[model samples]
Target chain A: VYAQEKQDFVQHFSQIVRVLTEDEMGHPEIGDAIARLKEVLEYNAIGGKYNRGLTVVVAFRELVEPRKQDADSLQRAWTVGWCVELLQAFFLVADDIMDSSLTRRGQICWYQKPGVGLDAINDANLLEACIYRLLKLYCREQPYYLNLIELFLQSSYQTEIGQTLDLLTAPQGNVDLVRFTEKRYKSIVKYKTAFYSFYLPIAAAMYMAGIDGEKEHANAKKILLEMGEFFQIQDDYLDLFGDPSVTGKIGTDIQDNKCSWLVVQCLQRATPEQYQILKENYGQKEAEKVARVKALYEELDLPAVFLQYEEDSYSHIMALIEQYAAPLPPAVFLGLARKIY
Target chain B: VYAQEKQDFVQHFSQIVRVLTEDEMGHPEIGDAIARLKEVLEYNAIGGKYNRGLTVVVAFRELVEPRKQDADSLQRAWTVGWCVELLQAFFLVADDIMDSSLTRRGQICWYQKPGVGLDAINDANLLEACIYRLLKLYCREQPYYLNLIELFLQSSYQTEIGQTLDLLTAPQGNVDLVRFTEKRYKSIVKYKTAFYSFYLPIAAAMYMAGIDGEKEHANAKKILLEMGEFFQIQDDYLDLFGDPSVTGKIGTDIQDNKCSWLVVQCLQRATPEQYQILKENYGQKEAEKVARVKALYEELDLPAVFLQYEEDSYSHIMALIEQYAAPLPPAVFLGLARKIY
Candidate 1:
């Protein structure tokens, strides 16, 4: 059902990419570069589920008056949607290389491919460059032009800080669990994932709809950032306890020495002996040590703790929505809640 | 002489780094991330001669009248100067990774160091983020704020496309040299190196001084881009023929199969046998193979050709300066010519 909801955005994404690159691709002296740029456009920017991009369209539809929401508005909405997707694709391409991960969605990570390698760094930058290109081409004539550019730049900056925090916190080696504080975890998720993922799309829609009020964006940001926190916390909870079949990929936060939420809760509750256990088994690639870490979580009844967190987080999000979702249409906030929750 | 002019900017740069990172580093929960961010800022941004940043300050001083350029404007000039340096730092950090460079600015590349590796990707991004953060903190209240943001974004986009073109033209391990053409070389450097290096810092100073006319910017862009072309052409010439002691780097364009201006001119002049020799010897790691490619250039009398081209280019640039020097101070153009030539 959700896939169908996203199909239009997913379908229209290629057009946005074509508009972004076709002129450069048409240049005679560009040589084979024209082909490579299109290949990059297709490979990196096209595959994501595009939830963030579609949210821009969804929010635009829900917030704008029907009479003003014409074909041009719809086209601009999707163009901006792909802009979000472009930003997302930019991060994923670089992040995959930094994390040294193997797969994204389903295929091999772009950076890990035979020929792509470190060239993916520049490719990732080009993906980010596309966002602004599309914005300038589509939205430069609008009143919200500077607003959208500043918003994207601000989000891009915040995410960079968050990414730096994530890398330093969970550097592939180094097994010290002391840094996995709850406060640090929230900070990482908020800056790294929340602003770009939650606030950027809807805020883009807000500005496009001419809702350039600072108070409105501030109100939406407070709720959306809180919601992002809840979303990442639940992801951490699932990392420890969810069914592998459901996720398809097994979670390895324990093995990876991540500064995950579970580690924070475990540290809060651990006795000295248990601390010794985590200090040994955590961040190890040894299969048995990883299992033991999972066993310790089971012994702590962390699954029940996660369930309790889920219910608590859900209610807290609802309260935040009720309090902070205004100056935006009620359905704008409500629809996002329905989708995420 | 240029070094003395930039000494104050060089001295002031550390304060910019400290201002950007000290508060973030103060957070206890960020753990070692603070130290890492500081390390990245110091390592990637500090080693350069800072020609680009100093250009911003130099151009600002040249364009704005002495009475109008008070302490506040001077401070803002240095701040904006550092912003250009930040952009340069961001590009070099990522470019080193993509090019698989072993050293930069007389030191081991950041990614090549023992502890840094690919985490430098995120670190490069942090350097870019500092530019906007500084801009907002220093210039947000000024009327030129949005123009400056758009200017930076545009330059960044142009450079990214330029980078993609460069990577495509001379991809590692690709034996094909047919795509390396004079037209392609100009297109690559114009988009990749010229806009950011030549136009951005100067245009930034223009905006800062209230020279926001569209006609003026367009006129300035025309001359600066031409100057940028001549500058890069000279760099390519130097890559092949300049003294290694003066440049501080051994020339590798022959072994690397670079789409350099010298190569483009060589292809234009080479006979069939000489072209075959290039096809066999270029891009090879063997010292003898690279020597043979250089030998072919000598057979083609490329040195005398370069001398002729140099005189032609110098005269062409002088003509452009004469044509475009109006509507602004003559020193603005002449100062740049003095530095580059």
Candidate 2:
């Protein structure tokens, strides 16, 4: 029954997407860029575990016993789901621009496409506006509409703060060894990747369900953010060691000067010669330079350190989830953690 | 008392403007471009006649006769007014990019400065987002908030349509003289300049005032849009014939291949040789070539034609305002018209 509802919900949501696609395609000069950007958004959003979007409906189910399950209620849930997706779309577009990535989700990055070099920024804004549009269309009459708007705005602001800090600490061409310390890397990962991606979904669901008072939402955020940090740290570790075929791309974090977990660990363990090797080889686009950086990671015993860090991070997050699991739905945090881990 | 209230209202609105200025200044890596963009937004938004923002207050005053005089009501009015200003900032930022102009509102255009080429597009999006942010911040609890959002979105859509048409018809490298006509030029101006700049301010106020559902808002739009058109045509006329000292800068519409009001009027009245002169002298950046174009305009009696067009446009707007006077505040449209004409 839930599967059918999810399918129906997606169909209803696609209606808005279709209108946006048509409007974009109507302008032929930028039509190709619009189409490609739309594709990137769809692939990343639609194929996502759907956990974030489903949280709305799940929370709605808990708030009202019967849950209505009618067209209007379902539509409201779908709109909220789409808002989550749109928020993600907003971050991904801007992040891709900042990361200077060549591809996302197996396709060319939107900014890298022809004629879309920088207009992707505006396109990202349009995606954000679409979230509000969808909200007005379906949720304007709901008692909790204002709450939802506030939640989204607050989340966006928090994410932007995290992004600002991340950019400041790891700005392109400002690679000092001191900036890549473990403490700074953790702060960057938690803020830049954790809050919006992990905490936002469940928090939005709580708001939609009218269970989102300040205290309860704060607790939820505290737990989910920790989980989000663990997930990103794992992602950083996997980037260096995960099978490329399974992960879908060879990681370039070392050569890109990213403040990755692996780099932080290597920095902690580096001898003088190893540190020099890292400084010289890191962020170099040449294959041999990248290979040298990878070889130095081996020389510094980085892989074992990464495994130990991941284990500690996961255990710490799990303990926090257990401690804060009361007065909130444990499944919410557990479900998100399981998916990411 | 009214003046004191208005002063307080304007001061409150300055908070958002300050936020915008600070954000722009915060991104100093791009050099003078960011600074110039912020200055343009500050001057144009704060220095304008402010009829649009004021209309929100006036419309509210008309809607809730005695209640509108209260502090809460006035605050709502000012918030909506700020929304209008934010929308204008969004358009001007993007429009400057498309127009390739070096300055606006007596300041250097953001895109003209070093290191700020396409990033201005993102800055424009930031301006647009500030509108919705301010709206949700101030008006989310109001009954008419959703209606206000819809009004702004619809107006933005219409303006974009106008801008798209303007870009298509007068693209920089692909100018075709045959495409320039009075009908096309009027359509472009109506869509691009009139709707948002002229109609949006009063329309937003009407919605806030609870008189939005009445036909008076539509009538007000019709009159204000006509006034907006006249304002833009005067702008085009001033570009060529107006004094540089008084107008603050020289006009380059002729050499830029812009579908300005002057060119459309000349096309309507030009003889064969005059047309030849326009075709050759227009869009030339050299001093002598631009001077020759100015001389041709003088020979074709363009100044006299502009004076006549101004008279006709002004009268036409006044007549429309009179026709739509009842049930709508005539001061709104008349106030805007008086500023430019």
Candidate 3:
């Protein structure tokens, strides 16, 4: 079902691009800018996995429940989904510039590409502009207009705050091991990755399905944020131990000095000598030192610990889904969990 | 009256800070993020000349009539006014980093300060986020919420597109002189400077005053964007000719390889030998070559051209104001013209 939904999302990308650029074409004062906007949409917004965006459609289908979701409704779902994708593009383009990252989606990060340096900042802002443009164009007449705007804005703010926290926790080129506490790690993950990744699409679906009750939305956020935390912890685990061939990219969390879940767990479990090894080996550019850190993670049984966590986290999320997903169908949460897990 | 209003705007700075930061103080999950948001607000938003933001309050006072402009109404005007400032800060903080600028408001640019670096990306975003935060806090119950939201979002999109054009025309190390034609310069200035600086604050005020008519905004924008074009041309003229002590900063436009109006005019009027002089002297990092560019401008009689152009622009703007400031106060635009001209 997720794969089918993903396919539908891929199909919708053309319409999304057309809606944005065609609208710009009407305003000739916009001139060649529409041409550039078309390029930005193609380059930044198109390449993502579409998981976050497609969740909107799947969850909308679940929440609306047995009613034949109309063509307009499906189009709105895709438009809003692309809005989510655009939001991600907005963040990644700017985030890539900040991280001095070289690649995204196996291509050069937009900022790193030729003649694209700091101009990508405005390009990122332009991608965000399209979200509201798409929202206003497609969903303006819908009753949920304000809700969708507020949801996206709130999600952006949450992710930005999370980003700030993440940056603070791991200042570039500084290895303050003490800053990578378990509590801090959870805070960063919850804000930076969990809220939008886990909660936004579901909340968007609920709003679209005419489910605006505060209690239900709160319940959805609580469950989804936990799911987001689990999802991010899983990501942290995979970044180090998972196969690059499996994930389709090389992991740099260690050399990048991220406050990864594995690092925090390792910190808690390691002895003084082990801590010395980690302090020396972590955040190093040297392959030998990185291997030493990985060797230490294995000796401390992090892979086994991760195995235990995977089991506990999955059960805990299932328990929460069972407990909280009343009034709304369990399928809404389950659809998301199936993808993330 | 204007001076008194400026004083009121200066006084409100701390309150805007308190409102944004103080609310975040209640959220324990946010931890020290509020403190940082406070710093972001203080550094980026507060020190602007307040012309753009104050226009909101001033236009509100004019359009809504004196009896209707009571304390609560005035307070909302101030909050919305600050929202405009927040939007400008959003552009500038990101802009400074992109331009590799050293200072803003006679101090270090927010992104360039030690420990700030690319983290300023998130900081600039925080500044943008505060616009919706303040709007929702103060204006959620108003009839103009969606209008104001759309207004700000549209203004942001327009500015972003303009930034793209400006960046593309005068890329940081690339000499692409042909791109800086008069038509392209107008496009850049109108989108980049005119709409937000000239139109947004007043349009925001118009919405807050319940003047949501399309005809009215179109008229206002038509006049204000022309006014914005005039304003930017003046800025371009000032960069080469104005005294450093008076402007409070050394001009880098010529050295930084900007798409300045004078350069475009110089290109239009220069003979082959003079064009060669400009080509050799413009975009230089050294003091001698930059002075040579200025000398070339003097020899080209660009100052007299500027004088004639300024008069022509002033007359044209006055005609636009005369024609379009109908059904709204002519005094509103005249006040702005008086300041800029």
Candidate 4:
């Protein structure tokens, strides 16, 4: 069923994508960037598990209990799934520019490509416009349509806040060791990496299915946020320790001055001399400097701490998921957790 | 009444503008570009008579002639005004980038200013998002809310097509004299400059009043489009002939390789020697080459031709407005015509 839904989304998304591409092809000056941006958008959009998009389906499930088993409910679920993809595209385009990233999901970043610099911003807007387009097309008559639009806009604003805070606390190429407090780190992870990625999908589903009264939604938000936090913590751990070949790209958070799990952990364990070494060595592009920071992490036993934290976070999130799994299925949380672990 | 409406718009637009500005201000890294973009948005958004926005109110006025207007109708009108501002901001940002403009309305262009290069694209996206934000905020409760969203999206796509064609035909610093036929020039202007500026306002108004399917709306589109064409042609003429002090900036279309009124006319009238001279002089940074092109325009009686073209376009538009006047108000066309002339 997910496979069929995903296929439907790709077909719909490609129609708009083609419209944008044709617009570019007709303009020789912007043609190159247009071509490259289309490729980037296509690649990045496809790799995600479509969890956020699935929220619409899940939400519908809750809204129309026995009716959720019907074809109409499932179709609505697919529509919401596409909304998630659209929202993700919006963020990736802007974030790629902010990060000065050259590639995403092993393809050239939309902003870095020729003719596309900055114009990807417009492309991002187009991606966002598609969300409303799909929503209006499929769900306009639904009772919760307006509620869904408001929720999407509010979530986007929240993510932007998270993005703003992340950029502020850990600006690229400005590695201030003193700024890397655990509290700040946690805040960045929860807001920046987690909310849209983890909480948005489920929350949107809850809303669509008519489970989004302030109280029930707030409870869902609490549980999902905790799950989101743990998800990012896992991501930070994967950044260095995860196999680049399996992840399909090498991690560069250390050299990129990213506020990653390894660095935060290293800071917590560092001696005065070790701290000085990090200040000098972190974010340095030279291979030897990066190697030195990794060696220091090994010496400080940061890997053991990371492993322990992962275990505790995973268990804690599972417990919370169980607590909040009323009026909603546990399978949703379990499905998300299965991917992370 | 228009004055009060204008003030209401100013207050509402100002509120959204402030939200965007404050949001950007919260990110100091992008502070410079955000400031520059905000200034550009404020300048362009305010200077234009609120014809597009006011059209919504006027359409609503006609739609419910005998009834007291509901809160919903008034709010929809305001939302449409905000959409017009958002659409204008979208074009201005991208146009500044394409034109390599130093400033817009006496302030630095956001893309040209320090630290703002390329990021202006993303900033432009944020401006586009504000349109939908306002739509969802103000019109979500209306039955035709989805219709409003679709209208804006379709209009944006059409405008982008026009923009792509315009950019391709007249690439900066790449004067392909072969591409500058009268037909191409008209197509570019109609699509790029006129559609959004003229038709968008009235079309939005029709949607708001729930008179979207009226045949008279087509007549309005026809009249407004012709007016948009005349308006752009006059803009080209003013670039050369209008007083710099009055216009508040010197024109650079000759050196910018723009497909303006003067250049296309020059292309049509030039002798072989004159054409060669133009080819060399056009888009040159050197003062002498630019001066030589102006000298040739004077020698070839290009100014007289411009005067004739201007008179002809204005009369043609006036005739169309008269033809369409019974179904739509004469003021809508006359009001826009007065601004350009």
Candidate 5:
């Protein structure tokens, strides 16, 4: 069923590109720009695994009644799902430029593509504008219109805040482990990754279903944010330990000098001698130095530490869903958890 | 009176920054990020002439009843005015990076400052977020809350589209005069500059004043867009003709390969030989080539042509005001005109 919705969601994207570029379709002067917009959406928004976008559709279905899930509502659910995807796309494009990333989703990063450099910044902003434009077009008269708009805008803020922390915490070519405390790492993950990745899609569906009280939102936020953190920790663990065939990409957290969960944990457990090793090997681009850092993580038993942490995180998230997801289906929270864990 | 309000508006800025950064203040983990946010707001949002922002304040006064313009109402007006300014700062910060500009408002560009390279991209985004944050804080309960949000979002879209066209029309180090047509110029200016710089502030005031009919907005947009075009033309002309002492900066439109109004007009009048001269001399870094381009503009009597254009533009704008400023006071339009012309 989720597969079908994902397919339908993918099918709906062309309509979206059409609606956004409709005004410029025959525009004599701006038609080329419109052409560029089409390319940007197709390139950035299409290749994601569709997990975040699918979460919107799946959660909306779980929260709303079958009868209430009319064609228009379902259409809106898919469109808002794409809005989430567009948000992710916007951030990824700008982030690629900031991080100087070369590839994403098996293709050239939008910023690194020929004829595109810093201009990708404006392209990112345009992707963001497409969110509000989609909302106005599809959900304008809905009671939750303002709610969704505010939700998306706040999500952008939280993510940008997180990005700021991430960039500041581990500035490129300036790795310092003292700054990578557990508290700061969690703050970066929660704000930068969890809120939008976890809370926004589910919370958006909640508003659409009229479950918009502060208590319920706070409750949903608690469970989903926990899941989001766990999800990212799993990502951090995978960066070092998971198979390339399974994860589909080589992990660079060690070489990129990212303030990942493994680094923070390693810092917490390392002896002075081990710490001295870290200072020399971490953030180096040479294969041998990166291997030395990875070997150090093994020497510190980080793989076992990650397994224990993952188990604890999953247990905590399940407990949160049991305690918090009330007066609404536990299945909503359960659905997301099952996907992540 | 406007001068006093401008001072008050400037004074209110610190409070706005305080409100935005308050959540992160004293946050042990994220306080550094908050400090950065504060710095971003102060560096980019301050030092503007406050014309666009003050337009919100002044127009709100003109359009609203004095009895209703109490303390809270006045506060919202000023805050919304700041929202406009925040929008400008966001665009300018990002634009400077894309343009590789060195200075703005008599200071180093935010992106170029030490230890703040592409990270300014996130800073630019945070500045954009501050607009919506200010609106939610001050105008959340207002009748036109959603109107103000949509208005600002749409203005951002229009400006970005204009930027898209501007970048495409004259990409850096790739000058092609064939792309510089008058129709294309108007589209770029109207979308990029006029709508946000002209229509947005007053239209926001109109919404605040309960004057949001489509006809009224369309009328105001028409007159203001003409003014915006004229204002930009004057800016372009001043780039070459005006004194650096008065303008506070040297003009680089010729050397930077900008699609200024003077160049568009020069293209229309140039002989084949003159056109060849432009194709060679334009977008060059050498002072001699820049001088040659300026000398050609002089040889073609562009200054006299610009003066004639300035007169015609002012006459057309006054006619627009005379024809359209019914029911709404002409003074609203007149005040903006006086400042621009």
Candidate 6:
């Protein structure tokens, strides 16, 4: 059932693009600009797994009354869900530029494409502007319009804050592991990844369902953010440990000087000798150095540490859902948790 | 009269900064992040002339009833005015990065500063986020909150569309005068510079005064946008023609290959031989080549052409104000016209 809805959600993306760009097509002057926007939307927005966008649709379906979930309401839900995706697209386009990543979703990154270097900055801004445009076009008359806008704005702020924390802690040229403590890592994950990726989608659905109560959003945010943190931790853990065949790509956090959860844990577990080995080898692009860091991680039994963490995070999230996913459906969050674990 | 309000407007910025940054300072993990935000605001937001921001306050005062313009009302207007400044700061910071500008407002561009390279992308985003945050913090209870938000969103979309048109037209490494027609220049000016710089502040004030009738805003936008076009055209003219002492900077539109009004007119008037000269000399970095381009402008009598265009623009804007600035105090429109002309 969820798979079918996911397909429908993906299909709705075409109309979303047309609605945002169609009015501008009439102008001869901006015809090229409109064409570029279509390419931006198709290139950046479509490749994502759409999990966050799908979360909005899934949660909205679960929260809204069955009778109220008419075709129009479902259409609105899907469009807003795509708004979440557009938000993701905006961040990723800019993040790729900032992080200097060469590829995304198995293709060369938008910024790395021929003829599209720093111009991606404005393109990213255009992607961001699309979210508000989508919201206004689809949900302008809804009573929850302001609520939805505020939710999206708040998510963007939180995500940007988290990005700042992440960038400051792990600057590309400087390899200072001193800043990579667990607390700092958690802050980065929560602010940078969790808010928009995890909390925003569900919170948007809550607003759409008229569950705009402060306590309800806070409750949902609390649980969703916890899930977000665990999800990011799992990603960090899998970066080095998971099979490339299964994960579809090898991890570069070790070479990129990322403040990953593994690095923070390794810092806690390493002795003077191990720490010395890490400081020398970490963030080095050489194969020997990357292998040395991996060897040290294994010597420290970091994989076992991660297994324990994974269990603890799953249990903790389960408890959070039990405690807070009330007054709303448990299945809404339960579905998300199952996918993550 | 506007100067005193402008001074008070600048003074109120400290509190605006405080309100946006204070909450984050309490969080120890994001202390660095908050500090960085303060630096972004101080470095970028403080330097611009207060024309657009002050327009919001001055127009608000004119549009609102004198009795209704209490201390609190004035404060809100000032805060909203600052939001417009924040929007400009956001765009300028990002634009400077895209344009590879080294200096802004007698200081180094924020992105050009040490340890602040592409990370300025996030800082620019943080600046943009501040606009909505200020709106929400100060105007959430007001009847026009949604209107203010929508107005700001629209301006942003229009500006981004304009920026795209600009970047695509005058892409950095490619010198194509075929793209620099009068029609394209007007589109870029109207969308890129005019809407945000011209219409946004006044339109924001209009919404705040509860005069948000669609026809009223359309009238205001028509006049303000015409003024914006004239303002940008004057700027383009000033680049090469204005005295450096008066303009405070030398123009690089020729060397930098910008799609300036001078170049467009030069293109239109150039004979095949002159066009060949331009095609060879334009966009080159050599001082001699730049001089050659300028000599061609003189040969083409571009200065005389600009004077005529300037007078025509002034008369055209005056006619627009006469036609559309009714029912709203002509003083609001008149005050802006005086500043521009």
Candidate 3: misplaced stretches above 4 Å?
A65-68
Alpha carbon lDDT of each predicted model: 0.84, 0.70, 0.88, 0.71, 0.92, 0.91
Clash pairs, model 2 backbone = B254-B283, B255-B283
Candidate 2 residue lDDT tens string, B1-341: 13444575568756766654465465443223334435545644665545566656665666566844677777778878878877887788777765666777777776666644554554565566567777776787888887787788777756765665665577665557777888788777877678887788777777776765657777777787778778888889888878999987687787788898877877787888888877877776688987887787787888888888788888887888789867766765665666677
* lDDT per residue as tens, model 4, A80-132: 77778878877887788767788877778877787556555555655665567
- Return the DockQ of model 6: 0.86
Q: How well is candidate 1 docked (DockQ)?
A: 0.66
Q: How many clashes in each candidate?
A: 0, 2, 0, 5, 0, 0
lDDT of 3 by residue, B1-341 (tens): 36769888778878888888777666676776777888888888876688888899888888896878878888999999999999999999999988988888988999889899888988999999999988998999999999999999999998999888887788777777878788888888988899999999989999988899999999999989888888888898887788878887667888888999989998998899987888778897889998888888898899999999899989998999889999999988898889888
Model 4 RMSD in angstroms? 5.2
lDDT of candidate 5 at residue A59, scale 0 to 100: 89
Q: Candidate 2 at B115: error in angstroms? A: 7.3
Segments of candidate 4 deviating more than 4 angstroms: A1-83, A114-121, A133-152, A177-187, A203-219, A265-274, B1-83, B94-100, B111-121, B136-148, B181-184, B205-216, B265-278, B296-302, B325-328
List, residue by residue over B1-341, the lDDT tens digit for candidate 5. Answer: 37868988999888898898896665777888998999999899999899999999999999998989999999899899999999999999999999999999889999999999999999999999989998998999989999999999999999999999998998988889999899999999999999999999999999999998999999999899999999998999999999999999789898878899989999999999999999999988899998899999999999999989889988999999999988799999999999988
After superposing candidate 2, which stretches have Cα over 4 Å from the reference?
A1-14, A18-67, A94-102, A115-121, A177-192, A264-277, A299-301, A319-329, B1-83, B93-129, B132-170, B176-192, B207-214, B262-305
Model 5 chain B: lowest-lDDT 10 consecutive positions: B23-32
Q: For each candidate in turn, give its C-alpha RMSD to the true structure in angstroms.
A: 2.3, 5.6, 1.7, 5.2, 1.2, 1.2
Flag the better candidate by lDDT, 5 or 6.
5
What would the TM-score be for candidate 1 when compared with the true structure? Answer: 0.95
Question: How far does residue A311 in candidate 5 sit from its true spot (Å)?
Answer: 1.9
lDDT per residue (tens digit) for residues B1-341 in model 1: 25655877887777787777665666665545667777888888887878888889988988887889887788888999999988999999999988898999889999999978998998888788788888887898999998898888788878877888888788877767798888888999899898999999899999999999998899889889988998998888888788999988778877777898888988899888888888888888899998887888888888898889878877887887788868798678778888788
Worst 10 residues of 2 chain B by lDDT: B28-37
**Chain B TM-score, candidates in order:** 0.96, 0.85, 0.97, 0.85, 0.98, 0.98
Model 5, residue A54: C-alpha shift (Å): 0.8
lDDT of 2 by residue, A1-341 (tens): 24545776677657867756676565554443346445645744664446566666665565544655677776677778778878887778767876678888777877788745554555565566567667776787888876777667666655654555555556555567677776666666665577777777677767666676788877877887777777787788788778999988678787777888777878888878888888887786698998887888777777787677668877887888788766665666665566666
TM-score of each: 0.95, 0.79, 0.97, 0.80, 0.98, 0.98
